[PDB]
Amino acid sequence: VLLKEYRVILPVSVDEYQVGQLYSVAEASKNETGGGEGVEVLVNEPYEKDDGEKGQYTHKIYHLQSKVPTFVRMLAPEGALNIHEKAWNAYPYCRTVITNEYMKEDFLIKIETWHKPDLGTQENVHKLEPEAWKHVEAIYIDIADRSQVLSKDYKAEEDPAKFKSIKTGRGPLGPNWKQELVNQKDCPYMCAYKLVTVKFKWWGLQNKVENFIHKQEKRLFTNFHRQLFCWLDKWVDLTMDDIRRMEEETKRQLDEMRQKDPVKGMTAD
Ligand SMILES: CCCCCCCC/C=C\CCCCCCCC(=O)OC[C@H](COP(=O)(O)OCC[N+](C)(C)C)OC(=O)CCCCCCC/C=C\CCCCCCCC
């Protein structure tokens, strides 16, 4: 079991992120869906636990046959590659549990996130146990840093070091945009502390795949947030009410696209 916490500082407020994240997840899902693969939203309902925690529940399935590397592909029968995502989104807090029916208990990708109005300086925000938290590598993802992006993933239109929002005036993010957040009254900020736990108990592959999965998560978080910022003008004025409507349409769209369109998005690698 390999744990790492990815801290993503962003030039948006905690409240704005709640909308930007929902908007961006919708667009990112569609960009990867078609030809039978991609995202399928099964459940999207509001929930309330005994303790009173309220939030939004979603159950999705990521069909991943040809989008996964060959060493992963020739590892299980077709269809066995799909993974399920169940998330209890009680924003600012969220717990996401990803599973695989084939490996059952041997597989787990859990992402627990705390969205704080600070600059990523809170240690052990998920309040684990002292020693355990010591074995948690903390990694910072700088959405402005070109060297943190994979060459094949780069797209100038999704580069915040070149993007300037027309509606807010934020951007482009320079090499020192972070340290700058403290000088300007404008340009709000927050930090997503994403604790990722990966378990892949497979004889002889555990170490390789648990590390491979973290890299893909780091890669996803980097591209996702660079896109979220660059899409700032598309969602900053949306309300939570706009999102809900947009989500019900997205669900339909994902299904439609998945059956017609050919496979699209990030090719295996
Ligand atoms: C024997 C066989 C067993 C093996 C099984 C195969 C395992 C696959 C191996 C590697 C794959 C690792 C990459 C994980 C891909 C799944 C994406 C993922 O883990 O999503 C979760 C992340 C973090 O959770 P969250 O709480 O932040 O948000 C969700 C909660 N909510 C909605 C309330 C905000 O969500 C986010 O960052 C938001 C972005 C979500 C939307 C992106 C759509 C992705 C669709 C396709 C991905 C294509 C890439 C395939 C990788 C191939 C490698 C080359």
Swiss-Prot record:
Tissues in which the UniProt entry reports expression: Expressed in a wide range of tissues.
Effect of residue 247 to K: Loss of phosphatidylinositol transfer activity but no significant effect on phosphatidylcholine transfer activity
Reported modifications of this chain: Phosphorylated by PKC in a calcium and phosphatidylserine-dependent manner.
Documented effect of changing residue 58 to A: Reduced phosphatidylinositol and phosphatidylcholine transfer activity
Keywords: Acetylation, Cytoplasm, Lipid transport, Lipid-binding, Nucleus, Transport
Any one cellular-component term (Gene Ontology): cytoplasm
Region (Disordered): 250-269
One function term, GO molecular function aspect: phosphatidylcholine transporter activity
Binding sites annotated in the UniProt record for a 1,2-diacyl-sn-glycero-3-phospho-(1D-myo-inositol): 58, 60, 85, 89, 96, 194
Regions of compositional bias (Basic and acidic residues) in chain numbering: 250-263
Listed InterPro entries: PI_transfer, PI_transfer_N, START-like_dom_sf
GO process annotations (BP): axonogenesis; phospholipid transport
Modified residues (N6-acetyllysine): 215
Lineage: superkingdom: Eukaryota
Activity regulation remarks: Phosphatidylinositol transfer activity is inhibited by N-ethylmaleimide.
Effect of residue 197 to I: No significant effect on phosphatidylinositol and phosphatidylcholine transfer activity
Localization (cell): Cytoplasm; Nucleus
Catalyzed chemical reaction(s): a 1,2-diacyl-sn-glycero-3-phosphocholine(in) = a 1,2-diacyl-sn-glycero-3-phosphocholine(out); a 1,2-diacyl-sn-glycero-3-phospho-(1D-myo-inositol)(in) = a 1,2-diacyl-sn-glycero-3-phospho-(1D-myo-inositol)(out)
Function comment: Catalyzes the transfer of phosphatidylinositol (PI) and phosphatidylcholine (PC) between membranes. Shows a preference for PI and PC containing shorter saturated or monosaturated acyl chains at the sn-1 and sn-2 positions. Preference order for PC is C16:1 > C16:0 > C18:1 > C18:0 > C20:4 and for PI is C16:1 > C16:0 > C18:1 > C18:0 > C20:4 > C20:3.
Family, similarity comment: Belongs to the PtdIns transfer protein family. PI transfer class I subfamily.
Protein's name according to its UniProt entry: Phosphatidylinositol transfer protein alpha isoform
Gene name linked to the record: Pitpna
